[PDB]
Design a protein around this ligand. Sequence first.
Ligand code: B12
Ligand code: B12
Ligand code: B12
Ligand code: B12
Ligand code: 5AD
Ligand code: 5AD
Ligand code: 5AD
Ligand code: 5AD
Lengths: 194, 195, 194, 194
Amino acid sequence: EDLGTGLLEALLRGDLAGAEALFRRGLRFWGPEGVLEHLLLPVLREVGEAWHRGEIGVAEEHLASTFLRARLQELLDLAGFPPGPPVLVTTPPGERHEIGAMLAAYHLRRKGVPALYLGPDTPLPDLRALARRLGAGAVVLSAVLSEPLRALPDGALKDLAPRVFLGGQGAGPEEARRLGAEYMEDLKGLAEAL
Amino acid sequence: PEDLGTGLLEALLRGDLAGAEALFRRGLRFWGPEGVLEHLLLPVLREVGEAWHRGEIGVAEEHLASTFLRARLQELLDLAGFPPGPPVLVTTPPGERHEIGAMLAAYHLRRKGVPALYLGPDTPLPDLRALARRLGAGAVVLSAVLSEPLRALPDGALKDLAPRVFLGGQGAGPEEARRLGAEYMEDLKGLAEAL
Amino acid sequence: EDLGTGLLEALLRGDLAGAEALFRRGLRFWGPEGVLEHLLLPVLREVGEAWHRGEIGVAEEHLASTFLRARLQELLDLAGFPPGPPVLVTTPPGERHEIGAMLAAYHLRRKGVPALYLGPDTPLPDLRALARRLGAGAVVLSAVLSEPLRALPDGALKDLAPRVFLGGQGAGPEEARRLGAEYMEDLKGLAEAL
Amino acid sequence: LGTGLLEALLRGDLAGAEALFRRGLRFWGPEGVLEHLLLPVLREVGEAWHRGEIGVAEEHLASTFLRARLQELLDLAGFPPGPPVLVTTPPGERHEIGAMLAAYHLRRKGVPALYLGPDTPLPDLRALARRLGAGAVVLSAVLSEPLRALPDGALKDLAPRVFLGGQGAGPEEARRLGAEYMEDLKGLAEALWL
Ligand code: B12
Ligand code: B12
Ligand code: B12
Ligand code: B12
Ligand SMILES: C[C@H]1O[C@@H](n2cnc3c(N)ncnc32)[C@H](O)[C@@H]1O
Ligand SMILES: C[C@H]1O[C@@H](n2cnc3c(N)ncnc32)[C@H](O)[C@@H]1O
Ligand SMILES: C[C@H]1O[C@@H](n2cnc3c(N)ncnc32)[C@H](O)[C@@H]1O
Ligand SMILES: C[C@H]1O[C@@H](n2cnc3c(N)ncnc32)[C@H](O)[C@@H]1O
């Protein structure tokens, strides 16, 4: 697992070419899904750990996250966008971590589901209005922090779309039930739940 | 055509991303890389903002269009060269979450062979200064869309970020740049010529 | 390696739309340089071998090569073209295979070198005259065939520019030395050599 | 705009040339920029070389640039499905922009013109047209000598219909070779439907 360390080290020195080359190598080794699990995700977690310990600053994290977000968006577009009633994917209001939402939309598209990624931080009434107008079959929410969920009143997610899914590190079964959403433990079960 | 701007937004609003991606590529091929940004990307984003402010569209619709257009620009950014040598750090002031202006600056720089490192938006100044120092960055470029994040900064706050510091955007002006200790830049074209 | 098989089949059946889609697919997966290495080049090589074996005709090679040349030029125009003294890229007189020179120009542009791609088959006096007038720092020559080089006298490439580089299948260290040019093995070390 | 574009290319200013061509496209449109900008420049470049005012390397640079631009327009015109029309040049003819221009005008009228590139051997051209079930073959002749080198009826059986045009071609010569002569690119698609 040299690639994880090397990719991080390449990004931290502002070597985009080297970072890109290391990521492509991961894609070659593990394929699209594999490179997320073994490279993109571990690096994102380590970046958070390094910042938390004071080993790197915010600007370093920004650089790494922006790079990896660009790579995931590539895979997202590579997965394609099929016809039919879309599934809207975003994060609850106040939640600015968006890569979990992108990841969810990615796994849905891989299964032929037209997951529309909106970006993060969408007000619930606006989310519901879009879902209604596009005739969206479902809404998917990624919660990394728990406070944006705790800030919501009971039943807040209930009427967003015919089906409403909630997951992420910030989400739990008890909280999803309170908000009126279906809890999904992992991305594996999310794709099959539809 | 003047239809492409209308066409792209209409496709996005109906959730036709495939059609939207196709219309953008037509713009890219007709207007060129810089052209499609000026004549397609920017006018659509401006209209999206005006339509929301008038109450014609909701926030979720803006999110959809902006996320799409950001993805297109990032695609163009990665296709441009990225030369070796001391980098130029591009970001936005703390409190500024509009990031496409900074992305544009980074892109115009890369297109002229300047190693612009796009960081993403909203970077605390001490962290920005520390990264520039460690990488021996030649310059820092800031895009300010809102004026309030700049006003919240004390005098000379941007002075010691890098050997050269630039400030532009709708939220920026020559007077405010002088107060923060940065060089004001009106347009993206002259930015590359200044380096 | 399946994309290559798929891409060639689409071209051989005259399906340009599918071919363009497949190439963009490979571009998003392998990246800009990667798609040239893992898709464009292996397809071009296989096209050459198939024709030589008598499996495909000239018109079929023509179609695929014209297509792939168009894709590479598309990538070339999207790369940065920095200011400053240019680097002239072409092929020796008598050499009409031009994609190697285009590749060279592309790798240079991606590294922030103002590589001016001239097209193939350029007379040496005219090439020298242009290099002189534009104050070019270097001349880069791609030789696919060996015969065009062998037909040139000793030191024929010596005075083209302050630096002259020569690479490609038709080129070798011994032949580069005789012509008075610097031999370059890899496109990656071409930018560094400047 | 023509003079400036030519001057920009002659000094190796791709950015300036690119910007000037884009202005021509915005002002005159797709067809207009061909007639008012691309074609006049290509002709003047040839005149300039003939007079000794510019060298071959200069011409190459300008020609390669404009070929890239035309190819962009070619792809912008799209490629509709159906029985393809194969477009190339006679054996020995290396000027390819006339053929590209022909393929462009066909596509703008909804005709699936497959551009092969220049210089296709007639038996190979005939074999591909047969296998793809091509409705027609279109040939661009800039020089007359490649036509004069062909025997009577040489072009007759390439496809159900065979069109010949360009500076090197005339009505009598087309008739001799068994091809239909076309003066202007405009009435090419109308003739194919007739
Ligand atoms: C990048 C980053 C940011 C960037 C985000 C950029 C962007 N555009 O996305 C920015 C700079 C905005 C940021 C800000 C902040 N962040 Co932050 N950030 C991170 C970092 C490094 C990675 C985030 C990421 O993309 N992770 C990738 C996701 C996909 O990984 P994952 O959560 O493990 O997700 C898995 C599963 O949950 C599943 N999943 C995800 N979504 C969904 C959805 C469904 C439906 C399902 C089924 C599954 C699922 O997918 C993954 C499978 O392995 C994390 C570190 C970390 N450990 O995650 C910190 C982290 C999340 N952030 C943290 C903090 C503290 C903050 C700030 C408060 C900092 C500050 N003081 O300003 C702010 C809060 C902003 C806000 N209001 O949301 C802390 C959270 C601590 C806590 N629990 O309170 C972390 C954990 C860092 C740390 N180690 O301390 N952050
Ligand atoms: C998308 C968007 C968002 C997205 C951003 C997504 C993202 N990740 O980037 C989100 C949802 C986050 C958002 C939030 C908000 N936004 Co908003 N948003 C927009 C929108 C529709 C387009 C943004 C964009 O990219 N525009 C394109 C920009 C780059 O073009 P431009 O500024 O004219 O740039 C040109 C030059 O300035 C130059 N330039 C830019 N940067 C630089 C840098 C240098 C160095 C140089 C030389 C030149 C230069 O480049 C361009 C060349 O033509 C605009 C509408 C608009 N008209 O801009 C509103 C807009 C900017 N937002 C607005 C508002 C009100 C907000 C919010 C306060 C809304 C709210 N109530 O929450 C928040 C504020 C968040 C924050 N703290 O930053 C208002 C701003 C009004 C004001 N000036 O006070 C606008 C104008 C909409 C409106 N009301 O009409 N926004
Ligand atoms: C397309 C093609 C043509 C087209 C060219 C169209 C165009 N405008 O470019 C046309 C139809 C004109 C053509 C004609 C001919 N060709 Co031809 N053609 C090919 C084909 C299929 C691909 C050419 C190509 O672009 N390849 C891609 C090259 C760039 O890949 P590569 O060599 O592996 O390059 C790598 C490195 O060398 C490096 N490199 C390249 N340049 C440089 C430069 C520098 C500085 C550096 C550092 C590195 C470097 O880049 C790559 C990195 O992986 C090849 C097959 C092949 N294997 O190449 C045959 C091939 C080259 N052609 C061949 C032949 C026989 C001919 C003709 C004689 C056929 C004929 N009887 O008319 C003529 C000769 C024309 C001439 N005078 O040059 C033979 C050559 C055999 C030989 N060496 O003797 C080949 C090998 C086919 C075969 N038999 O398998 N050809
Ligand atoms: C660029 C160029 C080249 C490039 C080609 C690059 C490429 N890949 O295409 C290269 C370097 C290969 C080249 C080589 C040569 N060329 Co040269 N070249 C030119 C130049 C400057 C432009 C060619 C071009 O594309 N013109 C654009 C075309 C589209 O314009 P047009 O012919 O007026 O076309 C119009 C109509 O005819 C119509 N048309 C065209 N095709 C068709 C097809 C159909 C079906 C229809 C209906 C209509 C139609 O379309 C246009 C509508 O307005 C011309 C100058 C000129 N006046 O054309 C010289 C020119 C054609 N070349 C010339 C010469 C001398 C040569 C060489 C012999 C030079 C040499 N000694 O090596 C070689 C021959 C190579 C060969 N075997 O073909 C001379 C021809 C003189 C003559 N004897 O007739 C010219 C005229 C220059 C000059 N003034 O002396 N050439
Ligand atoms: C979770 C991530 O949040 C980022 N982070 C921490 N504080 C701030 C701030 N004031 N502004 C922007 N990003 C911040 C760090 O880079 C960390 O990695
Ligand atoms: C400038 C853009 O900000 C978006 N916007 C406005 N209010 C909010 C909010 N509460 N949360 C997120 N985005 C918002 C709108 O969609 C507008 O177009
Ligand atoms: C190297 C490439 O040269 C092409 N080729 C072979 N003979 C000729 C010819 N007479 N004219 C044009 N192209 C030719 C073949 O298509 C082969 O793939
Ligand atoms: C018609 C065009 O042919 C080009 N031309 C003339 N002689 C040669 C040669 N030996 N090799 C390649 N191109 C040549 C010139 O650039 C002229 O403009």
